[PDB]
Amino acid sequence: MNNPSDFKSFHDFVASYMKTYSRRLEIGTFRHHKSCMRKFKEYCEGLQFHELTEDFLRDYLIYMKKTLCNADSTAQRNLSTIKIYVSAAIKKGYMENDPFKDFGLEHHHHHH
């Protein structure tokens, strides 16, 4: 196989990079997200580092729970699936911080 980034979209990126995790994952969750990300092309577009925001994760959390109608575990899992490629892009890519760092962890206490 020789395909230098044939994925323009986040859901395609995850589906490809996931191979690094599926080798150390079970098939159950892999196959479940596999079908989702493919038909998820309804919104289209690739979505880059700058389009991936905390508010995006927030809005899509609501969208997935509300409009798609799913459980929190399902939503959090699916969002952390996006978090996978985001985190990859953070670890050895070009992204500095993940959305869930500010979205999930409010510092609360920082000296003063």
Contact of 21 with 85, CB cutoff 8 Å: no
Method: NMR
Whole-angstrom distance, CA of residue 30 vs CA of residue 95: 24
Q: Which of 70, 68, 84 is nearest to 34 (CA)?
A: 84
Dihedral (CA of 39, 42, 43, 48) sign: positive
Give the CATH fold of the 1-112 domain.
Answer: DNA polymerase; domain 1 (1.10.150)
Contact of 37 with 12, CB cutoff 8 Å: yes
Domain extents for the chain?
1-112
Whole-angstrom distance, CA of residue 46 vs CA of residue 101: 23
